[PDB]
Design a protein around this ligand. Structure first.
Ligand SMILES: [Zn+2]
Ligand SMILES: [Zn+2]
Length: 58
């Protein structure tokens, strides 16, 4: 089994890598979830974006 990312999973991994307002604990947890099972990428990305947006500088 070849486990190189589909587009979909890649765009989510990079997004998560680069969301600016996550703490590294938070980021690492989301990345670990995608490592574990890349098929949950959609849901994990949506959570990560919510959390990023909630923590934006104001
Ligand atoms: Zn940052
Ligand atoms: Zn302000």
């Amino acid at each position: 089994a070849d486990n190189k990312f589909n587009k979909e999973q890649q765009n989510a991994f990079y997004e998560i890598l680069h969301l600016p307002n996550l703490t590294e604990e938070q980021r690492n947890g989301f990345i670990q979830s995608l490592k574990d099972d890349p098929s949950v990428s959609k849901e994990i990305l949506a959570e990560a974006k919510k959390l990023n947006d909630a923590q934006a500088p104001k």
